[PDB]
């Protein structure tokens, strides 16, 4: 009927609702290619399906907000992975080697006093 | 923090622009925080002593 | 063609071409081409004799231009110097007039860098 996945990447969330259908995806009321398609990595958001080679068995309704559109793409990837895993647990053994179920914990490092951007030490000449 | 300059507190500064702010504790002129009315040094000292409610060391 | 002086721009968009007039930037070029009803996209060599006459008629007497403009600016600076004003003093010495510092770079008003001993 419906399988849900959350996903998260670099301060971005994307509710992924997988409902068996033709294979067409809606993202915030817009098409998958009207939000994307100007971003080459967008196809990566559909990599979980290609992992199980379904690609036509699930329509997707995704509600994305947070960060920029690239982190949104990766959050959509993780959400599709989680919903697909909730569909059939036997898919985990097929998704774990690909690491699609891994949460990407890389976050913008906090800026620090004395430096310029959290690590860029101010230039000095000493003479 | 000369004593005469503690005349800053003045109901008649003769002009709105001339009215600046000073540290009420040490009489400082610069780095005078408006929320506390203190300078930065007295801010640090009273914050260490714990005399500023809710003021805690930041770390993130 | 020859518009508003002895200057002739050629073989580019009419607005960018009018930019080569001394009293005219991009705003004045856009304003002229707008009030004259001329497509700013056409090249200069693609202009009608009537369009050139129209643009010339408008620009020639609607603002002050090359000769009178340079003479008026020189007269303004000369007046500032003659009245003994502070700005006239800054012009007299070749220093910044608009309140910039001189202990450092402000070199574009002082020309080349005349290094000395020390």
């Amino acid at each position: 009927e419906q399988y849900y996945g959350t996903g998260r990447r670099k301060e971005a969330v994307a509710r992924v609702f997988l409902r068996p259908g033709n294979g067409k995806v809606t993202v915030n009321g817009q098409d998958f290619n009207e939000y994307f398609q100007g971003l080459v990595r967008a196809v990566a958001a559909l990599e979980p399906l290609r992992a199980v080679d379904a690609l036509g068995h699930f329509d997707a309704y995704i509600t994305v907000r947070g960060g920029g559109k690239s982190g949104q793409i990766d959050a959509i990837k993780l959400g599709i992975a989680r919903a697909l895993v909730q569909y059939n647990p036997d898919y985990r053994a097929k998704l774990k080697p690909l690491g699609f179920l891994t949460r990407d914990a890389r976050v913008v490092e906090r800026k620090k006093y004395g430096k310029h951007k959290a690590r860029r030490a101010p230039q000095y000449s000493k003479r | 923090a000369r004593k005469a300059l503690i005349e800053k507190a003045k109901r008649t500064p003769k002009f709105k622009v001339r009215a600046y702010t000073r540290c009420v504790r040490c009489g400082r002129a610069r780095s005078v925080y408006r929320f506390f009315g203190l300078c930065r040094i007295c801010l640090r000292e009273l914050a260490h002593k714990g005399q500023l409610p809710g003021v805690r060391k930041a770390s993130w | 063609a020859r518009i508003a002086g002895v200057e002739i721009p050629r073989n580019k968009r009419v607005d960018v071409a009018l930019t080569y007039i001394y009293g005219i930037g991009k705003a004045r070029a856009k304003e002229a081409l707008e009030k004259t009803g001329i497509n700013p996209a056409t090249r200069v060599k693609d202009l009608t004799e009537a369009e050139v006459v129209r643009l010339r008629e408008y620009v020639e007497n609607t603002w002050k231009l090359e000769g009178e403009l340079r003479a008026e600016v020189a007269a303004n600076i000369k007046r500032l110097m003659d009245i003994g004003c502070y700005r006239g003093l800054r012009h007299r010495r070749g220093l910044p007039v608009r309140g910039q510092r001189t202990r450092t770079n402000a070199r574009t008003r002082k020309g080349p860098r005349k290094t000395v001993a020390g």
Binding site: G38, L39, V40, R41, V43, A44, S70 | - | -
Partner: protein
């Protein structure tokens, strides 16, 4: 890397050809962190490879990269107080890194108008065995093996 051995970063495969080498070339094309612009440049260059060559742009790309890889380079060494240009072999990772860097750098030396044309022409010329990148390979393999007399300083 003093304590550890600094294991190599594993890049994500390409979204089109599935090759990590294409991704590394994208990254060497990338400027100021503009990934999408670099991808536009490279894929438009690939569309230029076809309709100019019947061969798939992936094969031309890989053959050019193979033609740019140097076999021996020359590093400096301080011996007896003097500095010598010692020849020595090149690890495959450094071969790939120098190949991609030289490809991009020689492509931007071309007189072509837009970037995709520069990269496409450089890839084609390097695949058929010419261009600035192959000139760089020849110059390095000339400097090295031009100082064969220092081969015992290999270290």
């Amino acid at each position: 890397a003093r304590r550890r051995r600094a294991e190599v970063r594993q890049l994500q495969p390409d979204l089109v050809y599935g090759d990590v080498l294409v991704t590394a070339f994208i990254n060497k094309i990338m400027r100021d962190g503009k990934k999408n612009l670099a991808a536009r440049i490279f894929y438009d260059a690939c569309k230029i490879i076809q309709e100019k060559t019947g061969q798939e742009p992936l094969k031309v790309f890989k053959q050019a990269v193979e033609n740019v890889k140097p076999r021996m380079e020359v590093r400096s060494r301080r011996v007896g107080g003097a500095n010598y240009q010692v020849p020595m072999e090149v690890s495959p990772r450094r071969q790939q890194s120098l190949a991609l860097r030289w490809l991009v750098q020689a492509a931007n030396q071309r007189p072509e108008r837009r970037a995709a044309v520069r990269i496409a022409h450089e890839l084609m010329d390097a695949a058929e065995g010419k261009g600035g990148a192959v000139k760089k390979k020849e110059d390095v393999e000339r400097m090295a093996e031009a100082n064969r007399a220092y081969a015992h300083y290999r270290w």
